[PDB]
Design a protein around this ligand. Structure first.
Ligand SMILES: CCCCCCCCCCCCCCCCCC(=O)OC[C@H](COP(=O)([O-])OCC(O)COP(=O)([O-])OC[C@@H](COC(=O)CCCCCCCCCCCCCCCCC)OC(=O)CCCCCCCCCCCCCCCCC)OC(=O)CCCCCCCCCCCCCCCCC
Ligand SMILES: CCCCCCCCCCCCCCCCC[C@@H](O)O[C@H](CO[C@H](O)CCCCCCCCCCCCCCC)COP(=O)(O)OCC[N+](C)(C)C
Ligand SMILES: CCCCCCCCCCCCCCCCCC(=O)OC[C@H](COP(=O)(O)OCCN)OC(=O)CCCCCCCCCCCCCCCCC
Lengths: 174, 121
């Protein structure tokens, strides 16, 4: 279906075995499926055809809002309230986008577990590693900021992390 | 006393001549409307104490209450605005004339400022 992006939400190709009956007994599942298609699928398909015909006569569109990038809290001067406001709003939007990225990866993980079923521990190792990396980065970004989090606090955390990394590299080189 | 004894101050002058250069309060000022509301409340309380019908009796008396309150409120607001403008004038003059006491400071960005991070956990 073109409703969602197959690249963002991958699905492995579906391999369905062909029926290979070994008995002369009729298949109750097949008979009930035929009854279901005759009694439910055709009426709902006709109803949806009518509804979509009604929708096609009044076609109209909605758009995805685009935000241009603005200077961030690193570029903002001290107590420059307008720049701080713009940077904080941009940081909040980016935080929301990152949360939704983590949600997408988790949906991938859940879908792959359910799909692979009894062989999930081996066949879902690729989606587990992506989730591990994404969650590690997201945690390092916004792990323990607090209820009153802000771009200034996140920048202070990043500065602390950078100082720790620099000290570790210097100690290793020593 | 901060502004008592200010140079050029004429004693017992509610509004000096230099106050004429400031914008007078509008007649629809919310503060003036609140003063009129105070006058109306005073009229209602007067009717209540004198045991007249609170809302209906003494329309002339209530109108005089409101008018007197609005009049004194307009002049009071003029004086308040003049005094605050005078305070700002003196503050700006002192800041300008004492640059060594009020120096400009180099503005550093938060990319240069180092702030300690306190995790919430
Ligand atoms: C309206 C909202 C106001 C909000 C607060 C604003 C500030 C205060 C208002 C100014 C003063 C108002 C008058 C006070 C005396 C009232 C006496 C009385 O009976 O009044 C009844 C009177 C009608 O009765 P009446 O036939 O004349 O006489 C019957 C006797 O008085 C019958 O008398 P009685 O013999 O039966 O007397 C017995 C009674 C006597 O009791 C009283 O008289 C109560 C009122 C006096 C107490 C103090 C009032 C507040 C004074 C200022 C203090 C601060 C106020 C704010 C406090 C905030 C925090 C609480 O005592 C008791 O019942 C004792 C038990 C209760 C005691 C404990 C509770 C005390 C509460 C104290 C605080 C009350 C705050 C609100 C007061 C509202 C009053 C209307 O109605 C009014 O006075 C209504 C108010 C005026 C309305 C004008 C409407 C104009 C037209 C529409 C305009 C629309 C808006 C305009 C814009 C354009 C739109 C298109
Ligand atoms: C030339 C012909 C025209 C002349 C025009 C007349 C010039 C003015 C004449 C003034 C009246 C004649 C003298 C009568 C007594 C004067 C009283 C008043 O005018 O004086 C002023 C005084 O004005 C009053 O103080 C302001 C009254 C404000 C009333 C409200 C107070 C604020 C309360 C806060 C809550 C408000 C609630 C709402 C209230 C309704 C300043 O005089 P000043 O010599 O310098 O006082 C010395 C003492 N100080 C320095 C400590 C102050
Ligand atoms: C009668 C009973 C007694 C109560 C009388 C209440 C009204 C008194 C004032 C009457 C009108 C006076 C007047 O001319 O007011 C106009 C003035 C604003 O005029 P101006 O700003 O020049 O015009 C707009 C320009 N942009 O307006 C002002 O400056 C506003 C000052 C008055 C503020 C009044 C606040 C409320 C007072 C109580 C109202 C009660 C209403 C209900 C009464 C019911 C009586 C049964």
């Amino acid at each position: 279906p073109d409703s969602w992006d197959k690249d963002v939400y991958p699905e492995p190709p579906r391999r369905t075995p062909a029926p290979a009956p070994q008995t002369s007994l009729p298949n109750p599942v097949t008979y009930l499926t035929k009854i279901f298609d005759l009694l439910v699928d055709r009426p709902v398909t006709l109803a949806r055809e009518f509804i979509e015909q009604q929708h096609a006569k009044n076609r109209y569109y909605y758009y995805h809002r685009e935000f241009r990038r603005v200077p961030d809290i690193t570029e903002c001067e001290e107590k420059d309230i307008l720049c701080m406001f713009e940077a904080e709003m941009q940081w909040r939007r980016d935080y929301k986008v990152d949360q939704e990225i983590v949600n997408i990866i988790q949906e991938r993980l859940k879908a792959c577990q359910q799909r692979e079923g009894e062989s999930y521990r081996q066949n879902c190792a690729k989606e587990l590693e992506q989730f591990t990396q994404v969650s590690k980065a997201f945690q390092d970004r916004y792990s323990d900021l607090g209820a009153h989090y802000s771009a200034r606090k996140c920048l202070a955390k990043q500065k602390q992390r950078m100082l720790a990394e620099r000290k570790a590299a210097k100690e290793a080189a020593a | 006393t901060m502004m008592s004894g200010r140079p050029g101050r004429v004693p017992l002058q509610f509004l000096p001549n230099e106050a004429r250069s400031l914008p007078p309060p509008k007649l629809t000022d919310p503060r003036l409307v609140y003063m009129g509301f105070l006058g109306y409340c005073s009229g209602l309380i007067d009717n209540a104490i004198r045991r007249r019908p609170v809302v209906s009796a003494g329309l002339h008396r209530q109108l005089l209450y409101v008018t007197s309150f609005v009049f004194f409120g307009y002049y009071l607001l003029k004086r308040q605005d003049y005094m605050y403008a005078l305070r700002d004038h003196d503050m700006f003059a002192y800041v300008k004339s004492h640059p060594e006491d009020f120096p400009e400071k180099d503005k550093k960005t938060y990319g240069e400022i180092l702030e300690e991070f306190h995790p919430v956990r």
